[PDB]
RNA sequence: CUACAGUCGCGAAACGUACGUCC
RNA sequence: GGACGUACGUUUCGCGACUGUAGA
């Protein structure tokens, strides 16, 4: 929005969405319903509240914006396509992300168990520089405050993954303009 | 060690000397309230007069918990605290414990048995009576059998120093009332059966009650059943073959019962099996050798249909693999016991479809949808907060082991540890301590009273998983029945105390009139000598002239010809009930019958084969008619009392 | 004009002179076998003796059909065929028709009225009674009221020339029996009430009956109801709002009908409406001016909740667009019937959410799924071959008119004629739309599936019980039914007032008349001859005028108030004048001395001064 | 199966799938069940017993094999993608197909009921040559008998359609190898 | 006005299965 | 062995409401 725009916003796909969500026709707004829906049974179903993308990345030019407001507890980060769907995001071999846990602590995971302070970013943006493995969570307005860095071994597709609390109906996440 | 403000408002009418139905929603709050009434009652007495406060406990863990508290508190004041249980009722005189103690915590079942014998002939020796969990005093309870002796002394005209009937409960309850007019009629009927005038509730100290209330939120999640049910199609073909095989020896099998069209794997089919099986036990073929063959074959054809119908309810709620392990467990036990022509045909008919049943059970697309979202709600809370304890309530004990093996061997639930209560992340119990902030009601329909510890609440959930609209709408009206309970209590609390003692005085006289009208004695005993036959083999076991009655509850056999008719077998869990010691278990001593006839116990010095009427058929030797009795009191015959001078 | 061998097998025990239970599942075979028994009974009579064979027809189209065939058959033999219907027996002597004719097809309801008046004092004048559809002779039927005089004459000691009680039918029936030993008792109770011993059935010529049997195959199609009920949420919000503004008139409203927590859109809600409607009619205030406003307001509140719940059942079964048509017809009817402060509140709130209900109705996303598989099975059978004309069985008269807006009101279905599809509510591809060569059965719950499944079990146990009775002896068959007829005869053989009450309306509570002016015409009709009642009512023409043998339904009556328009009764012409025959159901009886009110639904449950009518 | 193979086996899509079919993971077998399937309500749903494919056409090389046995009545043919969804196969203005009707007559439509004899092709094979408009149904082993001629105006997306009797349970089709 | 049939609901009574408690 | 309580389900009896059909 303020710096040099380097990438375009991703879009949700219906081939990795679980049987509990009802993402609409704009493909950037997931929502939880009261009753789950019967979908196909394949190896791409997460059986969780996780959503993956299909936007193919590039050499070094990556940036996307995702709003996690109007959410009780969320988790947004980077995950690989060559991963088991039954596993939890942030517990696999190499998937670093930031999760807002139930104990009101904004924790962060890296392949460790380190925690941040008591902050609460509303509009969190993720800067990615895969040419040298640079990650920085410049969310909003705090003189480009990152406060966390992850090192990734970029040799695989790394579509951004998302997670929200699926046991609370009415919760929704929205992707907005960078 | 220190009382509070809300622990003194409840015991304030109790110290005045009147009966109270104090309802505290805490676990240790009811223990501290009762200690305040017990300490105040003994101090107000002058010299020479002493108190005899009795604390009734309904269960043995409740009896042993309150025995340590009442002994570690009334020890500096010089009071004697004792306890009489079922393992302690023998080897001691019952009259000498009450006259030499004050703080007896004996169970109410011993007091009902003593009132019929003659020891402690009246309740005037006691000065205070505390009924823990007094909401069970509805009909024929051991709490109610003491009140029948109490109300007969008050309204009889021989009233002496009657004691107080205070009771510390946690939920007064409404029952099966629909409106507030019937809900009000239940509380005054409970107050009449307990002789109450005051109902204490925390009204001025609601702030301190909010800290410990254990009030969770409702999280109803209705799911759907499976569409592609291929496990049911293979089982129902075996049930139609066994039903047709049993019709080759009984053409009127459909006429023996009045149930409608039955679906396999339901509760309506299970009632049809018992009604059919009880109808083939009264066959009267005069050959008396072919009769023992048709009745033995129809008993085995109805027992396999009972296990086939029970295995489909397991596949409806639990996993498909654990339903196959229930049939293979039943067929392994029936092979080791005995083998004949009837059981071998049914065994080899199941083995021909065993490989077909084992292939559809190991399919990843045949997962139960009730278990498919139970794993989803168990992996979302543990990702949110990974230090939570949960609890799971199961209705049937045959499903509490199927969901234990489901977690042990699941990659998505590798963090849970089994806590089967038929270092523990889950607790798989059947029927209920204030430490697990998650409640899951897996098809389990008064709500769960998880009020045991004086800790905190911290936020809990009440997920209800079911696959039918009956269990969804039952909890919706249970919140309405619980809402109208507090309204009917507050309406009763704004009355006058002088008219409420007269309002319940007409209910105690009306309920005694029904109790004095239902005094129909026993009929004339049949002096004819009938014989008892087996239920599976229909072999002659004994006659009704060798049956002796021990203590008006148990029936033994006196003659020596019966002693070679059974074979012994050791009990898996022996125990003792006040006159006996369970040592063995008697069975039918035929070739391949192996029917459970009763039990073998030691009464004083001898060993008596105490039998039950649920495994015999009474055939009269004069006419030839056969009848099926289910209880020993319904079998009216010449009941000769036991005499140890003979043998 | 060609009787086959299987038609002659059924008539073999009938010609012997005994009462039979001949049953045939076809239509053409059942009328042709009765002609052979009627021809054989009259030809076998000697000279000087004449037959009086009667044919008890139940309905009027059955009476009209059996009158043309019996006249065209017995015309060369020289027989006197006639017919006595309800629109025929007025001012005609019954004794003259039965003495001048022999092939009388008179209605059995006229014979019950004749047996009480004195004419035809015994049933011995007849010789061959033919009961059409004799399976209705169970309890209190007009067929069962003739047999109460037949069994009284036979068991009375003076049994003379009794006629034959041969009865034609199409199905013996089982009833409410579950086992074979219980289904056996129903059949022998039917032959005991009909005084017969032989049940004639086909046992040698089954190959003729299989050619014409009209027996398709069943096909169960059970589906789940809709879940996204956007129409229900706006309606139930309007009903919960209307119920909240009705609690300000009557404080103790919720404790009147205490059955359970009611749900909208079900039949349990409809029982809650009529119970609370009757509770607001027994109110007694001593001002008599505010009471007339309270019961008028609570009547319009309970009736609007009745019309809202009535349209809710149509939305779950029929299309959503017909549910709004049922509500717009009710509101436009009261728009020209009267206007006060009470109806103006409910009409203005309905027009507020009228565009909200119109928006959701036109979208095909919120559509009932019971019409979806009905549309699926219609375009699948006609795609194979255009020779699959259908018959639809509809129970509710409001539900069959809702389907007429779906045949030509939907662009997918166009090869139908609302002919090509029948909408007969009461009778190769038959569809059972909530009614309980191939058949179908559409439903939304498992109750209709299990109800039809035990009907096929009832047909299996009926045919087994028939052949069990056909191997008994004739001596024990007449002996078994003798113990049944003596048992029912014992049960069959086993106070006015002098006060002065007044009659008040149910919704207006106005003084209409007293009980001293109510007269009795023919023990069923109650009218008022007083002059004060003549100004308390207003007339209104009848939409469908008819008569029943003594009257003329010329006009309906209504309450003469400002906006009441209550259905009080009807206006008839009995002999030479007019009398306002009213009904006790839409009235309230109040005592002058006691003052308490009572609600009665039938005239026989209201014991009062029953003064007979006087022409002077 | 003995000549030069020109095309590959088709695959059913989940965007034009009927609400009564329960096609498995191999996407080449239509099967009708007792209960319908809850799907979305859009303009792509046939609301009939039909199904479409995902293979776009080419110049001249079209051939596939489908098995029409174990079925009471079937109908296999070729239809256009630009087709109204409320219509049934065989009534469109350009749809060459063959219907095995209930009268045991292998009928065919050309938009004009072209009634034929009482032949019963077990496993049918459809030849298509869109370059010159050549259609001939050599089913199995009948010395390449054509038995029908059709001319198409192929200037549109021409995804193949299918049809099966949905009122009889157990009815199923299977696509086999050529 | 009489009569039949179907659905739903309010009560009473009896029985079966399952679970839990105590002697 | 026995006694008691709770929950689900079933078999009846009796009463009431509404809808539909038929007849006078
Ligand atoms: Zn035995
Ligand atoms: Zn009026």
Numbering used by the authors:
A (entry chain B), D (entry chain D): 252 to 362, 364 to 430
B (entry chain A): 241 to 662, 690 to 699, 706 to 718, 722 to 923
C (entry chain C): 241 to 658, 691 to 699, 710 to 718, 736 to 793, 800 to 921
Please give sentences taken from the publication describing this entry.
Riplet is a homodimer composed of an N-terminal RING domain (catalytic domain), CC domain (coiled-coil domain, homodimerization), and C-terminal PrySpry domain (RIG-I recognition domain). Each structure contains two RIG-I molecules, one p3dsRNA24, and one Riplet homodimer, but they differ in the relative positions of two PrySpry domains, which depend on the relative positions of their partner RIG-I molecules.
Given that the footprint of RIG-I on dsRNA is ~10 bp, we designed a 24-basepaired dsRNA (p3dsRNA24) bearing two 5′-triphosphorylated blunt dsRNA termini for recruiting two RIG-I molecules. Indeed, p3dsRNA24 successfully forms a stable ternary complex, resulting in a significantly enhanced Riplet KD (from 700 nM to 6.6 nM), enabling large-scale purification of the complex for subsequent structural work. In the structure reconstructed from the major population of particles (70.1%), each triphosphorylated terminus is bound to an individual RIG-I molecule (end-bound complex), thereby enabling the Riplet proteins to adopt a head-to-head arrangement. Despite the different relative orientations of PrySpry in the three structures, the PrySpry domain uses the same interface with RIG-I Hel2 in each case. Using the major particle class as an example, the interacting interface buries a comparatively small solvent-accessible surface area (889.5 Å2 on average, 1200–1700 Å2 for antigen-antibody complex), consistent with the low affinity between Riplet and apo-RIG-I/RIG-I:p3SLR14 (0.7 µM). At this interface, the Riplet PrySpry domain uses several loops to recognize a rigid motif composed of an α-helix in the outer surface of the RIG-I Hel2 domain. The side chains of W415, Y417, and L419 in PrySpry insert into the hydrophobic pockets formed by F616, I617 and L624, while R342 and E350 in PrySpry make polar contacts with RIG-I Hel2, resulting in an interface that is consistent with the first RIG-I:Riplet structures obtained using artificially fused RipletPrySpry-RIG-IΔCARDs 23. Single point mutations in Riplet, including F616A, I617A, and L624A in RIG-I and W415A, Y417A, and L419D, which are located at the RIG-I:Riplet interface, drastically diminished the IFN response in the context of RNA ligand p3SLR14. This finding confirms that Riplet interacts with RIG-I:p3SLR14 under physiological conditions in the same way as that illustrated by the structural work using p3dsRNA24.
